[PDB]
């Protein structure tokens, strides 16, 4: 791989409804967003079937749950502007249809929920800078004007809350290194300058919080192995050294915190199967990668069910959506084999950043 490569992304975005039922969003061969949902919040539940949102889109959809429980989806439109669509009530399959937020978008959208209940969207703009827009009141369809945070982005952005409620945003920069920028006060439009975390990355950054509040960032490195870095203090400026883990991965990673508070990472491996690694103890060393049977055609997307069981979604070689899950709510649970969520085929609508 080259230093400027961006690893294969996940094929769907997933969210938990207010009642924790999983719901997935993807783009089909008609270039429309389709979605499907569990009928009950357990991994062995039946799924409702694929339902279409009318409208042609030009990016991967991003989904987040509002602070009042309503799902809301963000996508780039045929006019290269930002559009969004929301449930009109929590746990209800009635949606608003696509509404305009304007702007000029050159990446997939990334959504965060501020700790005061307001959604905030981050995108690469037409000048390759980071731009953002936010709800001006919690869970309300009232949005700010577009505002620039500067920088030069060469990946999609990834945002996450710090334990103290400050949003922090990660993105690859013009030098192919990981850069970040952060709110200096919780849920306020007051931001730091851009700072580099060094090290080249060859995937979008993936961010998760560990139980003790500190952010941990995962990405594929220049040698195509997983690497990670973590906060070591109580602010956004104190980080560990980068560490890599042996094993060539061929997609973006996906990280999740399991029931016991330990981190797990899933990625497509060098043999194009799903690979999994987990922390063996608190902050502990990482296990050897374990492989699941079956060739996959996307990065994994990982979610948790209402009983804590982890569930993984991938594109199959038939271009359909497949999933598998843990049989029990336990870190050492066995796993099912891949099962089909049939009815449509999916395309990778990710914005080509070049």
């Amino acid at each position: 791989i080259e230093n400027s490569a961006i690893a294969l992304s996940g094929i769907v975005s997933v969210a938990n409804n207010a009642d924790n039922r999983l719901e997935v969003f993807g783009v089909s061969t008609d270039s429309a967003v389709w979605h499907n949902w569990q009928t009950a919040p357990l991994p062995n539940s039946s799924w409702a079937g694929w339902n279409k949102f009318n409208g042609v889109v030009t990016s991967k959809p991003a989904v987040h749950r509002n602070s009042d429980g309503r799902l809301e989806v963000f996508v780039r439109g045929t006019d290269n502007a930002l559009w969004h669509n929301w449930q009109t009530a929590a746990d209800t399959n009635t949606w608003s249809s696509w509404q305009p937020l304007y702007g000029g978008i050159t990446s997939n959208p990334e959504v965060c929920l501020n700790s005061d209940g307001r959604l905030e969207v981050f995108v690469r703009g037409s000048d390759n800078a980071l731009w953002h827009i936010w709800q001006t009141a919690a869970h309300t369809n009232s949005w700010s004007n577009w505002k620039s945070l500067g920088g030069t982005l060469t990946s999609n952005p990834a945002a996450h809350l710090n334990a103290d409620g400050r949003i922090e945003v990660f993105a690859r920069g013009a030098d192919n290194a990981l850069w970040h920028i952060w709110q200096t006060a919780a849920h306020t439009d007051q931001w730091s300058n851009w700072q580099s975390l060094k090290s080249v990355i060859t995937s979008d950054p993936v961010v998760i919080n560990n139980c003790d509040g500190r952010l941990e960032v995962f990405a594929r490195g220049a040698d195509s192995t997983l690497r990670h870095i973590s906060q070591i203090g109580s602010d956004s400026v104190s980080w560990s050294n980068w560490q890599c883990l042996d094993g060539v991965i061929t997609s973006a990673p996906a990280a999740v915190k399991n029931i016991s508070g330990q981190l797990e990472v899933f990625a497509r491996g060098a043999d194009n199967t799903l690979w999994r690694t987990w922390q063996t103890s608190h902050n502990g060393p990482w296990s050897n990668w374990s492989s699941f049977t079956g060739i996959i055609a996307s990065a994994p997307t990982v979610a948790k069910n209402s009983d804590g069981r982890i569930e993984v979604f991938v594109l199959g070689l038939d271009k359909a959506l497949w999933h598998l899950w843990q049989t029990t709510s336990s870190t050492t649970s066995s796993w099912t084999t891949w099962a089909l969520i049939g009815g449509i085929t999916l395309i990778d609508a990710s914005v080509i950043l070049e």
Copy 2:
């Protein structure tokens, strides 16, 4: 103290709104529930002022946020039945007024949110057994019939979710020991038998989860010191030995998990001031109790703001509500002094269990 004593409880119940603004509920000298809320989700925010719900009540109110963000309050009425009252929309100060759930109640109500989004209420019934009633659909005003879980209760119940979504309920039994009972499958009406955790307790039990998922229970013991016990496995049957901490406390304890994932406990101390202890490291040893200036007349009620800062509410000697909070989002932050939330005086409406 005697083995059957129940320590002084907190004077208000508190919840975070959908936008994380704190809102407090207490009973005034007119025997009505009054509430007050932050106007913005920060501890130094102004408060809106005390507002009355019409209706005479006969217990401490219990409050929980629905899975769609709406607060809902539960109380015993003048007919000794259960009544409830809800926000009609998230973050909105429009309420339904008191509606009947019937039953015959002989304790304060305790509310939990199942991991499938349904509220569930636990009470001691007219036969001194544990009874419960639940929403039959998430965040919907449709409730089950009353059902008995048996047992003999001599305290109020305390409920908490396990990491795998199973509700577990704790209560003092006829022998003054701590007993518990639990769902054997997440958010399902399938329950274990009652089991004893031994050790006498002289307060209601207080339950919190630690970062690695395991429940930890705090209570005052027969010698009036704080004691605690924790789960050591991945089920509800494997517990540690009881440990006590030196220092006589004169109220129920209140526990909170701070920004760094460590536990903190607040209680009224032997000198009738607020005392605080915290874990010095992960699962680590506990600090000596630290005292805050000022005599208090209730147990503390503890909450967290949108930026992680801890805030504590108590009854003052003037019978009004006072609070103090951390100045910064840091475990070693200094604290403010007591400030008044003036406008009404409060009474302890806790059901007398004798």
Copy 3:
């Protein structure tokens, strides 16, 4: 029990030879010290048989290994002075016989090894103060003059090295509380003032270091349960609160660090059997006490074999020495039943402190 009680002590002192074979020292009905040793450094080894040191003694013997591997035993003599006896070469059953160190002794002797290789002995003196004497060169029979550290002692002293090489000494004071005093520079005659750790204790203090260097002190409390306190900083002045563990114990405790770095405590329980508790995780909560079959007549003395297996020694109801041990080098190993080390009967020669 009364506040000034001192719990039953162990009946033998034990040490590892230079080759890690265990060797035990006790006092028989002739008031002489006898010793016995493993013939190979494994718990299932045969023992050599009981051998007598000529000389009448008036205290429990204390044993320590010199920095050149030679065992050295300290005891009070019929003249109430301190006497000692050493192996003339490591792993050799040739001894010097008793030699005088003079002084006037009113407790059992306690021995430490400084981190510069010099033995140092701590005793209560004729004025009830703490006195000490030391080797002036490592592993050499050249000793200092007696020197007082002041204080008023009502238990035997317990000494231990801090991680930075400073000796710290613990003893019960005139108010029945635990007091301590420490070197302010490693292996130097420069000492702090006495400071109180508060809390009454009803046994000698027992001190051990945890893997991260910090000292942890165990003792029986006024209510006859085990209590413990630990250092929380990098100095001798920062300590946690006291914690107790449920369960009445009827002897001094004995603490050991197992193969996995966790602490274990053994004591005679309320039913006069051997009880064991262990930390379930790093610094973690403590297990319920587990009981071994068999009534015992002393506190346990606990040692570790060359392969890490824990071995426990007690006085039986026949007044002989019995032991049991772990079957495998594993924290969850099963244990053998009590086996006799026959040939003599033993008496408790502990100095009566009253």
Copy 4:
């Protein structure tokens, strides 16, 4: 670098005497071993001056302390056989002079102390296999015959005790991967088969134990960065994945456990200065490398003083020995600058393995 490279080694071997004074052994321009020692066991002590052992040697010397406190040095002689030399009494500068152990040696010698007090020496033999020889009684000049453990070695061996007393030996194999072999019972001549840990290494392996007993192995990898792997169970067959740390190193690493139980690693960095990294928490993430002023010409050799302070030895550009140390017994202590231990110049006598 190439896959078969072996990084620059340390220029001296170091040991603590029975009284913990440091003593260093190196080879001078006369091809003889010289040694020097602290006069007192503190890093700011004066050193005695360089003293010569008569005899020409052809490897780096290895030193270990016997279980009776006497230092013993092992070296290859002009006849390519193993020779050794010992203190005739602990903490005494009287030595036996070189005595033969015969054999045919093609690596530097590696020494371990079994948990039953017997030294054991590991070498690559004339057939490139691992060979060993041992004391047949603790701290006695009585040795076994030479015995082969097979394998094919392309680095020097590194040996360490497991927590249960089993020796485990690590060495690079014919495929440039790290291999290991272990005793299956403590201090017994019963050994496993060779097993591969995979991953290429470009330095000798460096092994240390962490506080919870588990071995951790450090080495330079094929991309010239530090990598490490650790045991995750209670046996020698369960290991983590390999992890690397960013930063090019140009020598073998040296690892030490600090006063607080955390690991630290020192190595010559890409700019030929001394670099240091440490674990920021238990098992925690690793700090960015920190650099010390001054160009160095060997790997570091790291030791601990009697008060816990870390001290580092290196070859300077003047071909003399320099050292620096911590100013206080604290993990965050500042460090001195390089100071000269003058009197001889040193050569790297490491056996050329090619």
